[model samples]
Target chain A: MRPEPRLITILFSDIVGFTRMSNALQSQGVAELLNEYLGEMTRAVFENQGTVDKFVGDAIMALYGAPEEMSPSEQVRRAIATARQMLVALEKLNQGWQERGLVGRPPVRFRCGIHQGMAVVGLFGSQERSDFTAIGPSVNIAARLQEATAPNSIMVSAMVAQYVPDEEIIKREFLELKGIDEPVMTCVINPNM
Target chain B: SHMRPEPRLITILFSDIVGFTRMSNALQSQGVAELLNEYLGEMTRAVFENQGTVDKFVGDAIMALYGAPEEMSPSEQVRRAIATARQMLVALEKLNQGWQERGLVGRNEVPPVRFRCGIHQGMAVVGLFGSQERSDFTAIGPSVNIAARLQEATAPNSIMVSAMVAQYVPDEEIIKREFLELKGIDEPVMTCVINPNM
Candidate 1:
């Protein structure tokens, strides 16, 4: 059992070319490349003041202002900023991939989605397999948003958009999510804009 | 209507357009002035809509007050003013984009405008300043001086408030940073960088 903390912003990011790389390289080589990528990404996330919620295969889920309380606006700002920094870090990693003759496999790109709302935060499971996790509708919505995002894009929920003060940097569009009745307003971060 | 003067706490937010000097050099003085006026007009409207009083515009910057010329709790007024500033920044970006599209400047050439806000709770002499030819109601006191200095110390687009003000803000909303020492003040001000919790 765990204390049900208030809702916060959840961000889900996945490497764009994970499967392509797996098929291109030998099994061990693919594993080694993934380890390198995850290691670099984890370092950047921690440096940007985010807690690595969990790593699932080629994706990393992070929570802002959770476990550690932060206002909704602050959480979104930090999450987006961290996302941008992560992309920059990924760009550097892709450069390495190019040097190693892996460019054709699939140029490494990152897809991330952010959503803010209530979530249950606590540790669950028995001693044999205990884990700390945040569970709630917001987390699910965030995953859906990530799935809807394109490569090198940072997608955000409408609620998350309100907290972002730089409107020019965000492009608003409607996204139709699976199992959802209506389209949700999504904000895409345009670094150039 | 009956006239009664009531005490109120006000937070004054001042934002200066960065690179104004360079802009003046790039464009004619008249063109620069026109751009400044447009920017100020939009900002003033934002403040008014958020229940803030437009004190005045000084050069490329605008001075707006919240919780004054009206009655509201100090914390509530400050919070509202901060929210207004944040929204104004968003609105400003849109306006800048329009200008960029028009070729008035290079793409993304808009100056990185930042806001410095100082909030103080105290009684001040609030009345008309200057002669009948040019009179305007303004607040004058040491509180104003302290607030201005605090703003000066703030980084671009960052918020800095006194320790006293920080006490009123909910701890959950703030993540305490390092303390800062202001000039001419013997004691270091335990300032906190305040940002809206996302």
Candidate 2:
């Protein structure tokens, strides 16, 4: 039998306030805060059963399958669920601040971009400082979509949206991406009920 | 004489502020204390709002419990605790934004705080600790120690739970990460880092 090629879903999440937040807090404080934020966010990623590729400054690059694989539709569902849960969690954080007289600060917002495609997956790094990660056009496209997202918004490609429930998606506009010639159909996720 | 049996299954969460020493050194003692209070108070509210019991605040750290004294399903409590931790990070991020514009802290300083949670499900001796003047109810046993060790092993803001905890969660409901071999423990514990599904 011919070997089945590997398919996976990649999620790229970027924190909006990273640079500004780092500059505002002291170096030590920024490190502490980033550790805390990443810790919490990673927990969510893990809970959804996603493997964390690595953290790039304020952004987190995570993968859904590799060592273990899931169906394409399953991967998309997991990604959407992760985003919704994150928003719910953020609401609780806001309420906590209000009660503690710390409500003056601007809300922490996140922009997540997701895409699905085939990629080469394996243990690809040196033994000394190596980690398992996915690399391909799909990963790049997901990252670009995340960068295109507005604060507190989640932008997903049509491929990703196909796997997601239609009721959950709120169609906004067709985006004219820089690299991709065609205008990609995009949706802005509405998290709150 | 009346006899009472202790409640079973308690979830303990420990959180500490990083760089307390540096904060104290840079700012006045009063200022440092105020900041700590602000941070702790915010965290405590988040915890309690999620139905968790606030154990106490130890200097720059806070200890809390879920499914203790009052009984709760271990699995449900743990899920809530994990949710609370995520919210805390968001709150911290939001706080850092205002601090940046004001320049009270250096532009590059992020909030220097993180929390470690250790959850174990088992029987434990519950009673007041410390002097009579300031007594408190706490769990004592191998389970408590194991939870603490797990928390210590966890990186800041990460949730490290025992394998037993992971087993209770439905596999389809969550995403599983790599298995980790915890120190002083024979079996490798499975950790499930959670994210909310939208």
Candidate 3:
């Protein structure tokens, strides 16, 4: 049977200046840096009981309340929790990298975008290799939100923001994201956190 | 400690359906989801048939790899990727027909769905990425970036390959294109369009 589409929250995050970092370092260096960074992000997702959908280059696409069911509010809560943990983890990771005197020692930062909507989630693809992931317009929106996010910032759509505490969301604005016709009400998380 | 990343030479392929946004806007949500799943399924089959790995799906785009996790000669890797691209195009044609018959698409409304592909061969770090409990087997490197950039540059229903990939698949008839200075890439990337009929 075809997997039923469920209303879930999706989060997309990627390293800032990842291209520059990859270009300056050797392949091995980029790999190590990327793995450590992804490892932390993945841990945040798992700790929040979210799913690590997949990793694209230096980016992570995670899902909440998929392959399982939950209230929309709970999904947003979990996704935002994971996003906060991801940023905190990056700080520790950067500190360790600097202390180790690694090349490209400058601190690495990332952006996060979170949105909640209907998405199809299941093991889909060829028999040889299939991924348990979520896909749909909602997935696209999350990725676009991530791209729209500033370095070291978290951006959540209005739907996601509704579930976030007022104080936690530092700012809100309407953004014209690509492919999406309407101006999405985007909210930025408090940087102090 | 984590699984060590290994440097390996592999061919990376990127493909994305052309005009997907327009199609999604025109069709109902269910119609779009049904068509997209079928389309991706066909693409995945093609990659698997060529012994390639379906790395991941980003929206309507797909990242696939050949000659990683399992070793293969450079020439073979290039050959398999090119073959998979060509096969994907053919498979999509059949899919379009089936979709039309199923009423998921209208014959007169939207045009037949088409996709573009880009391929490159180079060294990349291949291994499991993410936490120890949850991770993905994928490739990451400058070459992967080039392949993705090349895919973005490709025209609908076309395939673009970097000079490195073209050099390995010398037997294929290719139309040489001007060097493109892709973003984040230091030098101009030599590129060619694979002959659609070849």
DockQ for each model:
0.01, 0.01, 0.44
What's the TM-score of every candidate structure?
0.47, 0.46, 0.89
lDDT of 3 by residue, B1-198 (tens): 666777789999999888787776667666776787788889998998999988887767899889878888899998899999999999988998998887766654777888889999998888886656656788877888999889888889999999998886555587757689887678899999887656
Q: What lDDT does candidate 2 reach at residue B49?
A: 77
Candidate 1 on A68-137: residue-level lDDT in tens? 7788888887888878888888888878877887665468787898999865565532233234566445
User: Considering summed lDDT, which 10 consecutive residues are worst modelled in model 3 chain A?
Assistant: A122-131
Residues B40-142 of candidate 2: C-alpha lDDT, one tens digit per residue = 6677777877887766554455566777667788787777666666667777665555444554345334344455655555555444432232234565444
TM-score of 3: 0.89
Going through the candidates in order, the fraction of native interface contacts each one reproduces equals 0.00, 0.00, 0.36
Tens-place lDDT per residue, model 2, A8-44, is 8888887775544433443444444444456666767
The i-RMS of every model, in angstroms, reads: 32.8, 23.9, 2.6
lDDT values of the candidates?
A: 0.65, 0.61, 0.82
**Highest lDDT model number:** 3
- Could you say which candidate leads in DockQ? 3
Worst 10 residues of 3 chain B by lDDT: B169-178
